[PDB]
Nucleic acid binder design. Structure first.
Ligand SMILES: [Zn+2]
Lengths: 62, 344, 89
RNA sequence: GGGAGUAGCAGCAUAGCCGGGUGAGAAUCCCGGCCGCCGUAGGGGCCAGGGUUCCACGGCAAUGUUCGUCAGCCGUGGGUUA
RNA sequence: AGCCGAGGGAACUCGGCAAAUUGGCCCCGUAACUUCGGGAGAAGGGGUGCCUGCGGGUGUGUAACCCGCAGGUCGCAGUGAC
RNA sequence: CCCGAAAACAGGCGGCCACCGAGGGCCCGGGAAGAAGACCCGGUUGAUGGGGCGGGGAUGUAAGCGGGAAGGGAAACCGACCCGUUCAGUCUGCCGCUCCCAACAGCCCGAGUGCUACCGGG
């Protein structure tokens, strides 16, 4: 009954939900929503979005 | 020649609108324990849990995702006792006895209640029925019950029903019924965690539908789609017999049918909106409330899987008239997680 | 009812008739909805809508009237039956 | 006569709303405002053909695919200068 | 009469019917065959927005119309619709 | 398991009224129900719809103001875009609390009999 962490928004999401994506090089990824999956695959930058944690990352990086 | 099975079943015909929104029970199970053989409540919503598997089969002993339905069950009121005798063909009612003090709202279902009917008259009628049953004429005893929808603020007009009693002695059944009448009855006194149940309700309505969706008919070739016949059947039959056969699929009413399900497992029984997992007391109501149904506040059943009906519909439950041979244990399973996040 | 004199602010939900009609008929239906709603909620026998209310309803063309109107209402009682007048708020 | 108070009065340019007026009577006629369509044509000019359909006043039995106080409809009077 | 559809991609059908794909401009590059005129826009590949400036052509022109360059910056997408 | 008192032996039970009026319908506020009809919930012994105020949710951080910005211009100033105020602003065919507005006022159907053989009891 473990909560997973999303690779785009950085939030925790509950057991029984979400997606695991696998790349043929073994690298794994975790998504909480089709929104985040789609944005990742199309190439929106999360460091610019004020509802992610990478945004606080970049705010420190300033 | 190409062979294939026919489209749809003929076992649920005629596919018409149900006679009543309150569902009727036709058959009862044979139980040795002297108890009331069912309960009734209102459907609230769905969630999921993570539990350790119990039932025989592969996956046993592992942590699995399980969908769950919640049914709110306020206590019922027992207002009557009926006696049945054997007539020429089948059973026929011999007589009825009622309680004298009934809620003001019951008159919304039963417009004509007696005028005075005091307690001493009620007791004399009980005595008459007792002596009648004490001879050997009587063959079955049933309870008369009404819901109390006003505790949970859903409505004020109750639903009135009849429920059978288990065992094989009319006198035992009558002693039970006489110790029950005039009082409120709870689901924990009737049901046991871990049982298998049959659920009964009227399904969601969908109005008039065509044969593609009502029977699983195929959509014709794209030439016919451009001709004006895509969602039609080919023909109504052959030259002879020179009439339309009742087995040919046609459009009509879909949904709002009487239906029965088999072998749904009872996971847990809750009280006052709470469930106790590991000493804690957690709320099943998700953040924001159930969609199209508010907060659960009285008592609730957790049933595995899905059940017929819309949200605020009346549900009836009975124990397992047709269970398998490798039942799982009658005991609440080990639950590791219950979801109570927002559902809208 | 409401006392004549007193100006009463009323919020008219026009979202309740969207999807009852096709898009190009949404504003002419909204006008009738406003009229009937105010008649009901002010217990009036006649309602007089202002040009300002009409122009606010037709501002964005015939397909996009606002979901909620804020309107002042003033009732005048005359020959018995009451008569309502609608303005913007 | 039955078919039947049924089909049709959609499809190629989906258009009306608010206030005021006239009148026995107004979804359909007039005024104002808002909202819309055409915009190398649905705008302007003018052959052939038609022949008074032109103008004003007064009307609504019939005509106009519905209504009509309106009208290329009906009636009474006028109107084309080298 | 129109819009979108996960995974697969003609397994549909007499038959890829119908629908879909491509698409404007500049630069690179371009086969067999040939009546040497063509084939040929063959095929195929790269780029394109906004802002801040710098240069050229004709012209008397800090008039007008055209041809190039550098830098900064935003978006899934710059012949962004047509 | 599904349909099933029009099953012509056209059923059983309990209760109410008659031998002015029990009961039912139109009407009103609405869906979980719906081609017209039908079905279900409520109608001030009230949270049925709206409003207000709170929860949950979808997008993605508003306008204005201020500070920067490759560069240009004596200087003032221009300047796509960036930063802060700012999980913001907008919306919500979901939930809860609260009588602030409307569920008013009415109108329509509607059972009543006698002869013969009586039955079982006066
Ligand atoms: Zn995420």
């Amino acid at each position: 009954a473990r909560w997973n962490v999303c690779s785009y928004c950085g939030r925790e999401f509950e057991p029984g939900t979400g997606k695991m994506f696998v790349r043929n090089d073994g690298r794994v990824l975790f998504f909480c929503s089709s929104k985040c999956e789609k944005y990742y695959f199309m190439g929106r930058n999360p460091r610019k979005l004020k509802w992610t944690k990478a945004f606080q990352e970049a705010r420190l990086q300033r | 020649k190409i062979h294939r099975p026919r489209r749809g079943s003929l076992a649920y015909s005629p596919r018409k609108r149900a006679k009543s929104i309150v569902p009727r029970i036709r058959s009862w199970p044979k139980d040795s324990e002297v108890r009331m053989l069912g309960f009734a409540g209102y459907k609230a919503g769905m969630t999921h849990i993570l539990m350790i598997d119990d039932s025989p089969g592969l996956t046993k002993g592992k942590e699995i995702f399980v969908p769950v339905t919640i049914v709110e069950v306020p206590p019922l009121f027992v207002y009557g006792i009926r006696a049945y005798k054997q007539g020429y063909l089948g059973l026929e009612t011999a007589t009825e006895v009622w309680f004298h003090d009934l809620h003001k709202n019951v008159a919304r279902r039963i417009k004509t209640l007696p005028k005075n009917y005091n307690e001493e008259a009620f007791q004399a009628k009980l005595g008459q029925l007792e002596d009648l049953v004490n001879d050997g004429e009587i063959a079955d005893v049933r309870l008369l019950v009404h819901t109390q929808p006003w505790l949970i603020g859903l409505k004020k007009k109750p639903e009135v029903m009849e429920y059978a009693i288990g065992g094989d002695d009319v006198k035992a059944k009558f002693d039970y019924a006489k110790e029950k009448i005039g009082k409120e009855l709870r689901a924990g006194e009737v049901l046991h965690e871990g049982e298998l149940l049959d659920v009964i309700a009227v399904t969601k309505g969908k109005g008039t539908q065509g044969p593609v969706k009502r029977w699983g008919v195929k959509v014709q070739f794209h030439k016919a789609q451009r001709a004006g016949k895509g969602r039609h059947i080919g023909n109504l039959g052959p030259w002879h017999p020179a009439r339309v056969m009742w087995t040919v699929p046609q459009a009509g009413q879909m949904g709002f049918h009487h239906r029965t399900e088999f072998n749904k497992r009872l996971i847990a029984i809750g009280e006052n909106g709470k469930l106790v997992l590991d000493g804690n007391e957690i709320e099943i109501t998700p953040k924001g409330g159930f969609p199209h149904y508010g907060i659960v506040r009285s008592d609730f059943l957790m049933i595995e899987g899905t059940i017929p009906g819309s949200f605020k519909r009346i549900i009836r439950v009975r124990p397992a008239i047709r269970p398998p041979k490798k039942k799982p244990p009658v005991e609440r399973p080990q639950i590791t997680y219950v979801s109570r996040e927002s559902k809208q | 009812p409401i006392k004549p004199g007193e100006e009463v602010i009323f919020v008219v939900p026009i979202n309740k008739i969207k999807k009852r009609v096709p898009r190009w008929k949404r504003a002419p239906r909204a006008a009738r909805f406003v009229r009937e709603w105010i008649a009901r909620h002010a217990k009036a026998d006649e309602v007089i809508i202002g040009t300002d209310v009409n122009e606010k309803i037709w501002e964005r063309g015939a397909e996009k009237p606002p979901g909620k109107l804020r309107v002042k209402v003033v009732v005048e009682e005359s020959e018995g039956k009451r008569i309502a007048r609608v303005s913007l708020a």
